[PDB]
Write a protein that binds this ligand. Structure first.
Ligand SMILES: CCCCCCCCCCCCCCCCCC(=O)OC[C@H](COP(=O)([O-])OCC(O)COP(=O)([O-])OC[C@@H](COC(=O)CCCCCCCCCCCCCCCCC)OC(=O)CCCCCCCCCCCCCCCCC)OC(=O)CCCCCCCCCCCCCCCCC
Ligand SMILES: CCCCCCCCCCCCCCCCCC(=O)OC[C@H](COP(=O)([O-])OCC(O)COP(=O)([O-])OC[C@@H](COC(=O)CCCCCCCCCCCCCCCCC)OC(=O)CCCCCCCCCCCCCCCCC)OC(=O)CCCCCCCCCCCCCCCCC
Ligand SMILES: CCCCCCCCCCCCCCCCCC(=O)OC[C@H](COP(=O)([O-])OCC(O)COP(=O)([O-])OC[C@@H](COC(=O)CCCCCCCCCCCCCCCCC)OC(=O)CCCCCCCCCCCCCCCCC)OC(=O)CCCCCCCCCCCCCCCCC
Ligand SMILES: CCCCCCCCCCCCCCCCCC(=O)OC[C@H](COP(=O)([O-])OCC(O)COP(=O)([O-])OC[C@@H](COC(=O)CCCCCCCCCCCCCCCCC)OC(=O)CCCCCCCCCCCCCCCCC)OC(=O)CCCCCCCCCCCCCCCCC
Ligand SMILES: CCCCCCCCCCCCCCCCCC(=O)OC[C@H](COP(=O)([O-])OCC(O)COP(=O)([O-])OC[C@@H](COC(=O)CCCCCCCCCCCCCCCCC)OC(=O)CCCCCCCCCCCCCCCCC)OC(=O)CCCCCCCCCCCCCCCCC
Ligand SMILES: CCCCCCCCCCCCCCCCCC(=O)OC[C@H](COP(=O)([O-])OCC(O)COP(=O)([O-])OC[C@@H](COC(=O)CCCCCCCCCCCCCCCCC)OC(=O)CCCCCCCCCCCCCCCCC)OC(=O)CCCCCCCCCCCCCCCCC
Lengths: 163, 54, 68, 176, 79, 496
């Protein structure tokens, strides 16, 4: 990789993601990745006819504060603590990265430990409502947009090379 | 309510099982097992977050 | 045949960017020192002189006339 | 020698702060002064400036994503190294739909068009990349702590690399 | 004091597959032993330079691929 | 002894709940970072090494080493010896080798070895390997036909850490998809490492030919074609659930305090659930014999091996057949052995001294829980193969009688080999772990010596007769263009 840098630092004013997630921290956990619902075969939210009927959005406009230019984003580069805050996976909070390894949120009472940690593969967590919201495009030219089919000249047209 | 995608199922704040916001819940013990330290301030916060020497 | 298998890159995958950190520190330093000079000469200094000059109404030991 | 003394000062000051709880894991009660400030200024400021301004920006951002037909996490640039390290490990199903959405968005943006409203009723702020961003950050932090804790010395401008740290050949001007 | 082992520890099993401490012969001089004291055909001392790794050297075999290339693909200007 | 397991009595170590705060106090001290320091000039900078500098040394405390046996409540057996050395050898043996693979599970035992010391529930892959390194520890994992071993050699002071790391490979391994995919490289390396050792490669050919597509025959290494389809974390986990269990595992420790090792191992399993023990299909090996002629275009030499089935480690023929191996002994022209190095073995005197065209002739005796292979291994130039086989067959026909002098020399040499091999700590660790896995019991070197002394010529004749009645296994490797056919070998041995 080229000369590069990431702001992976311990901030004095901003908390790490493990302490204050900026995303909507509700996820659905499965035992195996195959058990997730299929987005392509899942019915989506009903279409609307007015822009003022389009559904509401889970993001929090005011997730970030202080002086500075406005931004909405889910992620940061800040370093995580040696002993991260235990995620509340029972209520749907995400457990990934440092908050799984350096915490015991994965332990079940009687399950074999190998089986318990397997459920916390990052692939077994997906955001709630993923299959019902993610756009699955079938083309880059949506219906009603111009393409070569409409712009093609009639087959009786004269040669356009000479001009 | 919020029994179908049309009725608002899965829309935070409109679905009874989804909150409007998801703040992290408070904890009284650190994950290490140490008791969470508690500090009470009587002066406004430092201007840049600048820590003071031990 | 089939999609490529997922694998993490052996790292570290960052580094080698010290010239950019130098520019940051040089630029901040210069502009932090420009702030001090402009804040002093254009605002503080003028007001300080006025105070001292109105603190000479007391004239216990104001500057002497000759003392060349 | 004055360097040897400074080395003892640094060693002793760091030994005295081992195991300290980070500032964000300390239960903190705001100062009375801050409490008064947060009951007079914060309420009014939110009702008149912050609230309206940040809703104005947020709603516009949602509309822009809906017009492009993309999610918020699609907008991340892979020139960021955390994003790249996360994109290495995303599953193929997520990867396929992510590419198609980004391709459609660029086509529409380039041709100055917008997604048909029939396809715009979705939540663009679903954080589908979150699990893999967190894993990538964990991997990078381990490498940082276990393999990059010192400014290492290497033979300079050899093997196509400057020796100052970068790992790709011919990735600087002086390394052409 | 003298160093009697190579700076690179083997890290492999001493006894061979299916062979035990009873049926491995004498590990001090047996030909198949992985810890047989080497032969002083030309004198003592060359073991400080000897490569005790059994697998013959494959000149130029790559070990610096961080996952950026597939096998058989030649990098061009490191990209 | 509170519990008897498979013929051996163990002292039961009880699981106790202790606070992390209190156990932390007992973890060995080490630093990864050194941020400053207290300068101190080398006080011995001007002292030559011939001048002693240490005074008032505590008097030594020597104890005769004894092997102690304990078992945790989860069923994990712990066997340790302390020879009072300064470097320890901790090993974890699991009774899950290639022999327990089904044909659809080909290579999975090797795959488990490849993913060893990767990410666990409480430690990343990088952090596990950087810790093992900074503490100056060496080791790895090796998958065999009957067992898989995870070993670490360490300074005894750091055993609390090493025990944890080894056990984490079998307790809570995170078989993350992208970490497993990075281990596909090791398959090709393993094949090259095997084929480089010609003797071990010819041994792999013997077992595959001897036992046709069954337990011991099962290839030891995974192939890099169709086997990669199931070289996945999910597949590995299913294999581990079937075979890896605390009841089938045995933690051996050499040069470690038993009570300390048991304590730290107890703490490692106390708050976690090990893989439950489930019944599995355990079929006896089927010996078919046969022949395989593998060509190596680059080799001009011919390696010939003729083998026969042995009942195995758990039989009463084990010690007598090992005396037979020492009696026949063998050697190689490459080596120049001094007195007492097999110069007067039957093979050396009858084959090497009388046949200048023979490059090497040796006897081999592999031993597994319920089966084994015994035979001769002879090498030479390719065109000499017809004569090499004749020499080997002639020696096999001389096993009908043995002179008293030969028997005594074989018994004395075998006892010397046993005692001299035992003093190596890594050898002792592997011997103990492989013994318990195979038999559930440990036979000490002295006890084996007692058995060796009781072997008579009648026992040697009886064992040899049984071996020669089995269908031979006939392997030729290298330049095979002149070797006889398998039926020639069979007809020669049909008389026996
Ligand atoms: C169509 C719209 C067009 C608008 C055009 C406007 C053109 C003029 C402005 C130029 C900028 C244009 C773009 C932004 C405009 C709107 C900004 C906005 O809404 O900010 C939200 C955003 C939210 O702020 P916040 O989360 O409350 O935290 C910053 C606070 O100022 C304090 O929070 P804190 O916790 O950081 O406290 C620190 C504070 C503490 O102060 C004290 O302690 C005082 C005693 O320090 C000071 O105030 C010291 C100075 O405000 C800021 O970023 C602050 C600066 C805003 C400057 C522009 C304000 C324009 C007002 C227009 C009416
Ligand atoms: C009197 C009135 C005054 C009035 C006010 C005046 C105010 C203005 C004047 C005062 C200004 C003060 C400015 C303060 C600047 C402070 C900068 C700072 O904090 O630096 C920390 C910063 C560390 O940043 P970091 O992010 O922690 O680490 C950088 C990497 O990202 C991570 O790197 P890594 O540590 O992972 O990788 C190791 C590698 C990292 O190495 C680097 O990062 C070095 C980068 C070198 C850049 C220059 C390349 C060669 C020249 C290019 C062409 C220049 C044309 C002009 O380090 C080494 O190789 C260590 C040994 C380097 C020295 C020995 C070899 C020297 C060879 C020289 C050949 C020529 O280090 C540097 O900035 C390195 C020096 C860069 C400038 C070099 C200029 C050369 C001319
Ligand atoms: C104090 C007095 C003023 C100092 C001004 C220069 C500061 C930067 C010094 C330095 O070594 O930067 C390397 C650094 C190269 O980036 P890097 O990737 O961190 O360096 C590591 C590479 O190994 C280095 O390889 P590279 O090729 O990527 O960068 C070297 C390259 C950088 O280009 C220059 O040095 C530009 C000409 C000077 O040099 C040339 O183009 C060769 C020129 C002959 O250059 C810059 O990024 C800064 C270029 C200058 C920007 C304007 C600075 C203004 C500062 C004052 C306030 C306005
Ligand atoms: C008409 C209006 C006029 C207004 C004038 C005044 C306007 C001032 C605006 C800026 C300051 C606002 C108030 C600041 C309160 C204290 C903040 C604090 O402690 O921050 C720590 C705090 C660290 O928290 P963090 O979240 O962990 O930071 C993460 C970052 O990514 C950090 O990333 P990293 O981890 O890679 O770290 C990079 C490193 C980079 O740091 C460096 O490069 C270090 C070296 C340069 C800075 C420090 C030395 C400067 C020279 C001092 C004098 C030396 C005299 C020597 C005499 C020798 C005699 C023998 O920086 C840090 O670690 C944090 C410090 C950031 C640099 C600034 C530190 C000084 C703050 C005060 C600035 C000057 C105020 C003048 C006021 C005049 C009267 C009104 O920093 C921040 O809150 C973020 C940065 C905010 C400041 C950005 C400044 C940009 C550069 C230009 C500054 C001057 C602009 C105005 C110039 C106008 C005329 C030219
Ligand atoms: C407090 C002061 C203590 C003074 C102790 C003095 C003493 O006993 O010396 C032993 C003391 C320690 O010796 P040592 O224990 O062997 O350690 C050797 C190291 O030098 C020891 O140095 P180090 O390895 O610790 O390195 C640190 C060095 C670092 O020194 C520096 O970095 C010096 C400062 C930077 C340069 C400043 C330039 C300023 C330019 C301004 C321009 C403005 C333009 C506008 O610090 C010093 O030089 C002394 C620092 C003292 C305070 C603690 C810091 O030696 C020194 O301090 C040597 C300094 C050189 C005149 C006639 C000339 C010929 C005329 C011919 C024609 C007629
Ligand atoms: C200058 C020494 C020269 C010695 C001779 C030459 C050999 C050495 C060459 C290299 C020198 C590098 C510059 C060192 C500056 C002093 C800072 C330091 O290392 O303090 C150690 C230690 C801080 O440990 P640390 O390395 O920051 O690690 C703690 C954690 O990283 C995080 O810490 P935390 O978050 O728990 O703590 C809050 C942190 C928050 O503060 C910061 O973020 C610090 C930002 C950088 C401050 C840089 C100060 C530069 C002073 C330069 C003085 C140069 C004198 C040259 C004389 C030459 C004569 C020829 O507070 C401090 O770091 C306190 C800094 C107080 C500095 C007082 C300097 C008085 C100078 C007279 O401070 C003390 O306990 C000693 C304070 C007194 C130091 C006197 C010297």
């Amino acid at each position: 990789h080229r000369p590069t840098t990431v702001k992976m630092i311990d901030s004095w004013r901003t908390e790490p993601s493990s302490e204050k997630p900026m995303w909507y921290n509700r996820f659905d956990q499965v035992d195996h990745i195959s058990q997730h619902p299929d987005p392509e075969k899942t019915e989506k939210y009903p279409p609307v006819d007015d822009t003022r009927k389009l559904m509401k959005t889970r993001g929090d406009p005011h997730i970030m504060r202080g002086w500075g230019e406005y931004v909405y984003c889910h992620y940061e580069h800040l370093r995580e603590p040696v002993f991260p805050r235990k995620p509340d996976v029972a209520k749907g909070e995400l457990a990934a990265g440092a908050n799984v390894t350096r915490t015991d949120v994965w332990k079940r009472e009687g399950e074999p430990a190998i089986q318990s940690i397997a459920r916390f593969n990052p692939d077994n967590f997906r955001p709630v409502g993923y299959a019902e919201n993610i756009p699955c495009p079938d083309t880059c030219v949506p219906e009603g947009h111009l393409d070569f089919r409409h712009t093609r000249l009639p087959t009786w047209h004269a040669d356009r090379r000479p001009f | 309510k919020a029994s179908t995608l049309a009725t608002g199922k899965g829309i935070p704040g409109i679905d009874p099982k989804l909150p409007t916001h998801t703040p992290p819940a408070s904890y009284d013990v650190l994950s290490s097992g140490k008791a969470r330290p508690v500090q009470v301030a009587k002066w406004p916060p430092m201007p840049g977050g600048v820590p003071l020497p031990k | 045949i089939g999609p490529p298998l997922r694998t993490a890159q052996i790292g570290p995958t960052v580094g080698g960017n010290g010239g950019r950190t130098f520019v940051l520190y040089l630029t901040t330093t210069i502009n932090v020192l420009i702030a001090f000079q402009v804040s002093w000469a254009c605002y503080l200094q003028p007001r300080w002189r006025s105070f001292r000059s109105d603190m000479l109404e007391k004239f216990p030991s104001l500057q002497p006339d000759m003392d060349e | 020698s004055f360097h040897r003394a400074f080395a003892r000062v640094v060693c002793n000051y760091n030994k005295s702060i081992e195991g300290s709880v980070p500032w964000y894991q300390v239960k903190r009660e705001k100062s009375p002064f801050q409490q008064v400030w947060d009951e007079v200024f914060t309420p009014i400021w939110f009702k008149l400036v912050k609230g309206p301004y940040e809703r104005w920006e947020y709603n516009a951002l949602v509309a822009r994503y809906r017009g492009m037909g993309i999610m918020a996490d699609d907008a991340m640039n892979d020139k960021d190294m955390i994003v790249e390290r996360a994109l290495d490990i995303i599953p193929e199903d997520i990867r396929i739909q992510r590419y198609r959405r980004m391709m459609r968005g660029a086509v529409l943006a380039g041709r100055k068009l917008h997604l048909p409203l029939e396809l715009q009723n979705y939540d663009p702020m679903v954080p589908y990349m979150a699990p893999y961003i967190e894993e990538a950050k964990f991997q990078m932090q381990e490498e940082q702590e276990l393999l990059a804790y010192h400014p290492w010395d290497r033979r300079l401008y050899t093997a196509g690399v400057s020796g100052f740290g970068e790992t790709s050949m011919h990735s600087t001007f002086l390394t052409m | 004091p003298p160093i009697q082992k190579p700076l690179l520890p083997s890290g492999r099993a001493v006894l061979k597959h299916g062979r035990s401490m009873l049926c491995s012969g004498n590990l001090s001089y047996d030909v198949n032993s992985t810890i047989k004291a080497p032969e002083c055909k030309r004198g003592m001392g060359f073991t400080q330079f000897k490569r005790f790794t059994p697998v013959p050297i494959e000149s130029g075999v790559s070990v610096g691929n961080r996952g950026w290339f597939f096998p058989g693909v030649i990098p061009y200007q490191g990209h | 002894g509170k519990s008897t397991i498979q013929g051996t009595s163990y002292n039961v170590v009880k699981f106790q709940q202790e606070d992390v705060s209190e156990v932390v106090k007992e973890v060995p001290h080490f630093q990864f970072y050194y941020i400053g320091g207290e300068h101190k000039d080398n006080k011995y900078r001007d002292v030559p090494l011939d001048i002693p500098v240490l005074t008032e040394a505590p008097p030594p405390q020597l104890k005769k080493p004894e092997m102690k046996f304990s078992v945790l409540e989860n069923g994990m057996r712990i066997v340790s010896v302390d020879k009072q050395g300064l470097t320890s050898n901790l090993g974890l043996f699991v009774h899950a080798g290639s022999r327990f693979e089904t044909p659809a599970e080909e290579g999975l035992s090797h795959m488990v070895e490849c993913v060893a010391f990767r990410s666990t529930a409480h430690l990343s892959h990088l952090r596990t390997i950087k810790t093992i390194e900074v503490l100056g520890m060496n080791g790895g994992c090796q998958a065999g036909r009957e067992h898989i071993m995870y070993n670490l050699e360490l300074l005894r002071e750091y055993m609390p850490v090493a025990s944890t790391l080894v056990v984490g490979n079998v307790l809570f391994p995170r078989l993350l998809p992208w970490e497993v995919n990075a281990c596909h490289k090791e398959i090709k390396k393993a094949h090259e490492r095997l084929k480089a050792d010609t003797d071990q490669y010819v041994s792999e050919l013997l077992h595959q030919t001897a036992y046709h597509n069954n337990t011991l025959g099962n290839a030891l290494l995974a192939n890099e074609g169709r086997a990669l389809e199931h070289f996945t974390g999910d597949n590995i986990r299913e294999f581990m659930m079937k075979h890896f269990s605390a009841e089938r595992s045995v933690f051996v420790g050499i040069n470690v305090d038993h009570d300390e090792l048991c304590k730290w191992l107890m703490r490692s399993f106390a708050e976690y659930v090990a893989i439950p023990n489930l019944p599995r299909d355990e079929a006896k090996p089927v010996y078919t014999g046969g022949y395989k002629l593998e060509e190596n275009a680059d080799m001009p030499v011919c390696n010939i091996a003729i083998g026969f089935e042995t009942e195995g480690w758990n039989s009463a023929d084990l010690v007598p057949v090992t005396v037979l191996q020492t009696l026949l002994g063998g050697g190689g022209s490459f080596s120049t052995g001094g007195p007492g190095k097999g110069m007067h073995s039957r093979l050396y005197l009858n084959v090497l001294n009388q046949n200048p065209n023979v490059e090497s002739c040796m006897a081999f005796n592999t031993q597994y829980s319920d089966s084994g292979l015994f035979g001769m291994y002879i090498t030479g130039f390719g065109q000499e193969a017809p004569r090499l086989v004749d020499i080997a067959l002639n020696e096999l026909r001389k096993l009908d009688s043995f002179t008293p002098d030969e028997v005594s020399r074989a018994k004395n040499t075998l006892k010397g080999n046993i005692f001299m091999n035992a003093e190596n700590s890594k050898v002792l660790m592997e011997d103990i772990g492989r013994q318990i896995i195979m038999s559930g019991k440990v036979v000490t070197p002295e006890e084996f010596a007692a058995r060796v002394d009781a072997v008579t010529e009648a026992d040697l004749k009886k064992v040899a007769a049984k071996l020669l009645r089995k269908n031979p296994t006939y392997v030729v490797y290298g330049d095979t263009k002149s070797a006889p056919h398998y039926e020639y070998v069979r007809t020669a041995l049909a008389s026996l």
